[PDB]
């Protein structure tokens, strides 16, 4: 037999690459392309692939892009250096809100003004002074760390969905195997150009506004026997939650410099009220009993205890939640107060704390200040999942947890993998001299299909964001040219099928013509002879396509 | 661009003249297109160079798949549709400029390309060379 060169071979390799950031065509948006994701999903019949949501670079890539766009939005905003002064505070007489006085900087640098603003106790750090009941002195939290930046008017906290799209030459494989646990084989896969839109919703403990499971509740973890891993629970039903801050604050504007202002909380309209969340009781209870049972399947002969918060540090103990730019730290200890034993009105009130100083993304010194928001601050959302951490007592104790934002994205991106298409390949023949739809079928069947299908590959012919696009285009060109070049030197113009003068080595494969062509798919073949790739290429370029020209044409002198 | 012929298989100076006259001129003139082969300012230049490369390669690629190396004139096996244009050989070649023609048959661009790449330049290879096994 003889080596035949094929172009358009439906095989791929796992590969990492920068994906395009696509936005909403109807539209932190200037960086992304507002196009149609065109989710022309194709199912690959009879194809099984290995997915691993814990090693998915799309998650890491998203983490970086979410942070980067978020940071750009604060770039032109005011650094509140003038507020890192002694604050004289008194109790508001209109127990978490204090009335503080400052000597602020005026438009003129040689003048100061005495101004006041209201603050939440959580954002204020006492100096070496005690509560006297009338007055005491304070520092703003983080004045010993960073010049915290005020969010600008029109900074958007709208979790506008992001779509990731493959560069030409790459494809995104989606796992449709309902109940797939995030690792191992998926026996139902399909390919897309783009992912569904993912809303970069930021939270801890309770995952909000995501995609619900198609089947039953699925519990996923990198390692279920590792008590240091986060367990992601995907609900198949949403639970209604609505949060509100019913205390009518007024926004004041204080000049703190030559062309800049600070937005201060003040003039509380009459009543003092605690912020809270409204959670349906029957749905919460049903949800945990159902989660309990699924956990029991993973942890049999154990009592399940969804009974404890983290321990007391607000940053990790409460539910980090955003509402229209407002920041809530809600106490969920009343939700996670139950057990499960497999063989044994009507709402829930969650009190919430409000804080204006935000250590976003767990970074230190990258501080944002949230200005007060006037009006009806109420947000209604869907709990779609849980982040649980498993803790001797023949009991599996669980606590809600989080803070690693990657888990909020693994929870959506677990369905996707990125691979690189590798159109060249070889196989023996007896003759001497929608792209991946032909996958899961034998090489023979594909070779017929590819006489047409191979041409679908021809469809592939802001600061750092400008660079990401340039690298993407340059790489696409580079790979294209390398393949064109190899085909050129091998004498394979008319590349879909190219017979050559290189003989087949039984040492590469000793399978018969029909054993190979009718009992293997192209990927199986690629693996079986994969380490002879360089050998074959040398035989084709250094010998046969040189000898076949020199011994025929130079003789024509 | 394309136009019907009877045969089965300074760049813009030839403008304002008929297609016929230009087709003679272009046997030479077409080659003048071959002459085309700081922060944000660095980016503007890179985008410009990358685009020039991209457009070049797309045209080279189309000509390759249509079997049109020696590209200045390339006859094909795709028949002319009277539905694209029902003008006669001389009515077209001697009474139109290339831009007028481009407008008259402009929406058939994708049709013609498909006929050339998916059918005629596939069929013309498979039915002649695979038989040589």
């Amino acid at each position, epitope marked *: 037999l003889w080596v035949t060169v094929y172009y358009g071979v439906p095989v791929w390799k796992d590969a990492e690459t920068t994906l395009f950031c696509a936005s909403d065509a109807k539209a932190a948006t200037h960086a992304c392309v507002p196009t149609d994701p065109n989710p022309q999903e194709m199912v690959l*019949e009879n194809v099984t692939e290995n997915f691993n949501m814990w090693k998915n670079d799309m998650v890491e890539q998203m983490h970086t892009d979410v942070i980067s766009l978020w940071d750009q939005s604060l770039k032109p905003c005011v650094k509140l250096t003038p507020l890192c002064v002694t604050l004289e505070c008194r109790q508001v007489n209109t127990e978490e809100i204090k009335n503080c006085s400052f000597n602020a900087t005026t438009e003129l640098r040689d003048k100061k003004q005495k101004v006041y603003a209201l603050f939440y106790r959580l954002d204020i750090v006492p100096l070496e002074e005690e509560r006297k009941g009338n007055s005491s002195k304070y520092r703003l939290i983080n004045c010993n760390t960073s010049a915290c930046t005020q969010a600008c008017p029109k900074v958007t906290f709208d979790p506008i969905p992001i779509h990731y799209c493959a560069p030409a030459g790459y494809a995104i494989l989606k796992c449709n195997n309902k109940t797939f646990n995030g690792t191992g084989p998926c026996n139902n896969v399909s390919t897309v150009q783009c992912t569904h839109g993912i809303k970069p919703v930021v939270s801890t403990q309770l995952l909000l506004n995501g995609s619900l499971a198609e089947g039953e509740i699925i519990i996923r973890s990198e390692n279920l026997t590792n008590n240091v891993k986060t367990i992601i629970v995907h609900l198949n039903e949403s639970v209604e939650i609505v949060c509100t801050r019913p205390n009518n604050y007024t926004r004041k504007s204080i000049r703190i410099g030559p062309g800049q202002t600070f937005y201060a909380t003040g003039d509380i309209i009459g009543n003092i009220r605690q912020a809270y969340c409204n959670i349906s009781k029957d749905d919460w209870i049903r949800t945990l009993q159902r989660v309990g049972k699924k956990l029991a399947e993973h942890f049999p002969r154990r009592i399940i205890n969804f009974t404890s918060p983290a321990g007391g540090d607000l940053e990790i103990t409460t539910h980090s939640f955003n509402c229209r730019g407002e920041f809530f730290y809600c106490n969920t200890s009343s939700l996670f107060n139950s057990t499960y034993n497999p063989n044994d009105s009507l709402d829930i009130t969650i009190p919430c704390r409000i804080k204006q100083i935000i250590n976003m993304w767990q970074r230190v010194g990258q501080c944002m200040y949230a200005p007060p928001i006037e009006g009806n601050i109420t947000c209604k959302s869907n709990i779609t999942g849980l982040l649980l951490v498993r803790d001797s007592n023949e009991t599996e104790i669980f606590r809600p947890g989080g803070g690693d934002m990657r888990n909020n994205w693994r929870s959506e991106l677990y369905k996707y993998k990125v691979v690189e298409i590798k159109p060249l390949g070889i196989a023996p023949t007896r003759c001497k001299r929608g792209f991946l739809g032909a996958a*899961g079928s034998t090489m023979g069947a594909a070779s017929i299909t590819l006489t047409v299908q191979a041409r679908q590959l021809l469809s592939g012919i802001l600061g750092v964001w400008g660079i990401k696009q340039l690298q993407t285009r340059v790489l696409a060109i580079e790979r294209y040219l390398k393949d064109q070049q190899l085909l050129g030197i091998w004498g394979c113009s008319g590349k879909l099928i190219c017979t050559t003068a290189v003989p087949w080595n039984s040492s590469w494969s000793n399978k018969s013509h*029909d054993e190979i062509w009718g009992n293997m798919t192209w990927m199986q073949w690629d693996r079986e002879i994969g380490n002879y790739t360089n050998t074959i290429y040398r035989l084709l370029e250094d010998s046969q396509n040189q000898q076949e020209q020199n011994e025929k044409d130079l003789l024509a002198c | 661009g394309i136009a019907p012929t009877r045969c089965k298989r300074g760049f813009l100076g030839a403008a304002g003249s008929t297609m016929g006259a230009a087709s003679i001129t272009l046997t030479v003139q077409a080659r003048q297109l071959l002459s085309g082969i700081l922060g944000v300012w660095g980016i503007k230049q890179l985008q410009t160079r990358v685009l020039a490369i991209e457009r070049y390669l797309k045209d080279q690629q189309l000509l390759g798949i249509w079997g049109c190396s020696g590209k200045l004139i390339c006859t094909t096996a795709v028949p002319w549709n009277s539905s694209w244009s029902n003008k006669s050989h001389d009515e077209i070649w001697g009474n139109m400029t290339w831009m007028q023609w481009d407008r008259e048959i402009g929406n058939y661009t994708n049709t013609i390309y498909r006929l050339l790449e998916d059918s005629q330049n596939q069929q013309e290879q*498979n*039915e002649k060379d*695979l038989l040589a096994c």
Partner: antibody
Amino acid sequence: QSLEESGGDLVKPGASLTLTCTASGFSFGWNDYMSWVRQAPGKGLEWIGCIYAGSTRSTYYANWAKGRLTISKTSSTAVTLQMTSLTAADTATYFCARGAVTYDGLGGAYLKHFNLWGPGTLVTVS
Amino acid sequence: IKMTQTPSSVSAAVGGTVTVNCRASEDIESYLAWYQQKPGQPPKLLIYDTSKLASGVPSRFKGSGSGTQFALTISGVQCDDAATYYCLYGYISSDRIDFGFGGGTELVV
């Protein structure tokens, strides 16, 4: 393993037809070419076409029935022979069969096996 | 495809031999097959690739050929089956569908 076949009846001339061939005791997999033929009195089997299990390719002799013949995969165990206008159906009977080919690696394949056959049926008109 | 056959019918003494000739116009590189069709039945495959005996088929059915001329020889012949013997061929490609089957020969011995 055997093939069952049904759906033929007497229909108006020029009427459509959907015959179903069923994989009794099996499903169709790699290299299973599920084909149809026409058996006229005094003749052999004229080729209609076939489909490839594991893919969506459907190959048929359009030179006989372009615009008249569609061969469609349904279940993993069945194929439907779809006709848009019947004439010759009143002469030749239809049979479904499970066959296989050898691939050349040059973009095509040749017939080898037709091991399972359905009982067949005549579909006439009037 | 373009193919012919000869004869239209055959006969033999019982226990003797029968020859059926498949005469393609087209040059075929050993890709044809022989079938036996008993009345009321789909044809049964007898021979693969012009000469390989199919499983379940007796040694009585043998044959060979090349190019355009192929033949089935039946030896130690009985016509208990009262079958018509046929020649089959066909090739799949994306540009052309090359298929056919002969009229076959009816055998009585």
